[PDB]
Amino acid sequence: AQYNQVYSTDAANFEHVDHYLTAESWYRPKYILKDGKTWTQSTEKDFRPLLMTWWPDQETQRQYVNYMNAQLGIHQTYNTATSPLQLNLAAQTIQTKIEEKITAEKNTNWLRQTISAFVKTQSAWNSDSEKPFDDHLQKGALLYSNNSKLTSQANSNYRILNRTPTNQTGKKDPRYTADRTIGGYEFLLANDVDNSNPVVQAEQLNWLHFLMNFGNIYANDPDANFDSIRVDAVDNVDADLLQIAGDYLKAAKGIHKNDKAANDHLSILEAWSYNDTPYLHDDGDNMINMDNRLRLSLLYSLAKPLNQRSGMNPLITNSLVNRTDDNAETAAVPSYSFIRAHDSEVQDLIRDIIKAEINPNVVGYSFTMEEIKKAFEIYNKDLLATEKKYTHYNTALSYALLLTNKSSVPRVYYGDMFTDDGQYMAHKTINYEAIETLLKARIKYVSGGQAMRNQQVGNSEIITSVRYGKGALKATDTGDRITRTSGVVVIEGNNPSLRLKASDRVVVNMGAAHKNQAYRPLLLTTDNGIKAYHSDQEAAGLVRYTNDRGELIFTAADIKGYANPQVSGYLGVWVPVGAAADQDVRVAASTAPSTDGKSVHQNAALDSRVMFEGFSNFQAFATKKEEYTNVVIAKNVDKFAEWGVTDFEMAPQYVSSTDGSFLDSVIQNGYAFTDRYDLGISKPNKYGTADDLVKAIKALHSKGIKVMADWVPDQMYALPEKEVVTATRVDKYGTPVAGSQIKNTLYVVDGKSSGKDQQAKYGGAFLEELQAKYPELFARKQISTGVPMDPSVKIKQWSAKYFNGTNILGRGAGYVLKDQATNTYFSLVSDNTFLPKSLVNP
Output the smallest distance, CB 237 to Ca ion, in A. Answer: 5
Residue 52 · residue 33 · CB < 8 Å? no
Pick from 572, 550, 576, 443: nearest CA to 498: 572
Query: CA nearest 74: which of 50, 100, 93?
Result: 93
* Range in contact with Ca ion (rule: CB under 5 A) among 64-72, 199-207, 677-685, 713-721: 713-721
In the window 295-324, what residues touch Ca ion (CB under 5 A)? none
Nearer to Ca ion by Cβ, of 18 and 203: the residue is 203
Return d(Cα 635, Cα 74) in angstroms, integer.
Answer: 66
Identity of the residue, 205 or 694, whose beta carbon is nearer to Ca ion in the bound complex:
205
**578 phi-psi bin (left φ>0, alpha ψ -120 to 50, beta other):** left
The closest of 226, 274, 254, 288 to 609, measured between CA atoms, is 288
Which of 187, 643 has the CB closer to Ca ion?
187
Q: Does 192 bind Ca ion (CB under 5 A)?
A: yes
Site size toward Ca ion, by CB under 5 A: 5
Site string for Ca ion, 70-109 (x = CB under 5 A): ----------------------------------------
Stretch of residues binding Ca ion (CB under 5 A), selected from 90-98, 188-196, 443-451, 691-699: 188-196
Output the 3-class SS for 131-152: CCCCCCCCCCEEEECCCCCCCH
Stretch that binds Ca ion, among 183-191, 402-410, 599-607, 653-661 (CB under 5 A): 183-191
d(CA 818, CA 839): 14
State the virtual CA torsion across 110, 113, 118, 120 in degrees, nearest 10. Answer: -170
Smallest gap from residue 751 Cβ to Ca ion (A): 15
Judged by beta carbon, residue 239 or residue 349, the one nearer Ca ion is: 239
Minimum distance of Ca ion from residue 732's CB (angstroms): 9
| Residue 188 beta carbon to Ca ion: minimum distance, rounded to whole angstroms | 6
Minimum distance of Ca ion from residue 194's CB (angstroms): 8
Closest approach, Cβ 734 to Ca ion, in A, equals: 10
Binding mask 585-604 for Ca ion (x = CB under 5 A): --------------------
Is the CB of 417 or the CB of 795 nearer to Ca ion?
795
Binding residues among 242-271 for Ca ion as defined by CB under 5 A:
none
Candidate ranges 2-10, 185-193, 216-224, 362-370; the one touching Ca ion (CB under 5 A): 185-193
Range 643-702, binding Ca ion (CB under 5 A)? none
Residue 18 is a binding residue for Ca ion (CB under 5 A): no
Stretch that binds Ca ion, among 131-139, 187-195, 314-322, 435-443 (CB under 5 A): 187-195
CB of 663 to Ca ion, least distance (A): 18
The H-or-E segment that residue 218 falls in is none
Q: Report the C-alpha gap between 661 and 511 in whole angstroms.
A: 56
The whole-angstrom separation of Cα 414 and Cα 602 is 24
Mark 714-733 with x for binding to Ca ion (rule: CB under 5 A) and - for no binding.
x-------------------
Choice between 238 and 723, CB closer to Ca ion: 238
Nearer to Ca ion, 164 or 398 (CB): 164
750 touches Ca ion by CB under 5 A? no
Question: Nearer Cβ to Ca ion, position 500 or 725?
Answer: 725
- Of the two residues 237 and 463, which places its CB atom closer to Ca ion in the complex? 237
- Residues 326, 637: Cα–Cα separation, whole Å: 34
C-alpha dihedral, 513 to 515 to 516 to 522, nearest 10°: 60
Q: Which stretch binds Ca ion (CB under 5 A): 283-291, 305-313, 706-714, 816-824?
A: 706-714
**CB nearer to Ca ion: pick between 238 and 345:** 238
Q: State which of positions 202-241 bind Ca ion (CB under 5 A).
A: 236-237
Nearer to Ca ion, 186 or 750 (CB): 186
Neighbours of 223 (CB within 10 A): 12
- Rounded Cα–Cα distance for residues 418 and 424 (Å): 8
Whether the ω angle into residue 684 lies within 30 degrees of 0, i.e. cis, is: no
Per CB under 5 A, the segment of 180-188, 215-223, 304-312, 740-748 that binds Ca ion is: 180-188
CB of 531 to Ca ion, least distance (A): 48
Give SS3 for 752: strand
> In the complex, what is the shortest distance from the CB of residue 737 to Ca ion, in angstroms, rounded to a whole number?
18
Q: Which residues of 641-653 are buried (b: 16+ CB within 10 A; e: fewer)?
A: bebbbbbbbbbbb
Q: Is 359 exposed, middle or buried (0-12, 13-18, 19+ CB in 10 A)?
A: middle
DSSP helix/strand/coil, 611: strand
Q: How far apart are CA 762 and CA 654, in angstroms?
A: 14
Instruction: Quote the least distance from Cβ 192 to Ca ion, whole Å.
Output: 4
Query: What is the spatial distance between Cα 373 and Cα 416, in angstroms, rounded to a whole number?
Result: 19
Q: How far apart are CA 398 and CA 424, in angstroms?
A: 24
Measured between alpha carbons, how far is 261 from 268 in angstroms, rounded to an integer? 15
Please answer whether residues 568 and 560 qualify as being in contact, where contact means their C-beta atoms are separated by less than 8 angstroms: no
Quote the least distance from Cβ 157 to Ca ion, whole Å: 18
* Residues 118-157, interacting with Ca ion (CB under 5 A): none
As measured in angstroms, the least distance from the Cβ of 714 to Ca ion is: 5
CA-to-CA distance for 423 and 594, rounded, in angstroms? 44
What contacts 109, CB < 8 A, 6 or more positions away? none
Q: How far is the CB of 449 from Ca ion (least distance, A)?
A: 42
| Residue number, 234 or 573, with CB nearest to Ca ion | 234
Among the listed ranges 191-199, 203-211, 416-424, 636-644, the one in contact with Ca ion (CB under 5 A) is 191-199
* Closest approach of Ca ion to the CB of residue 803, in Å: 9
Enumerate binding residues for Ca ion (CB under 5 A). 186, 192, 236-237, 714
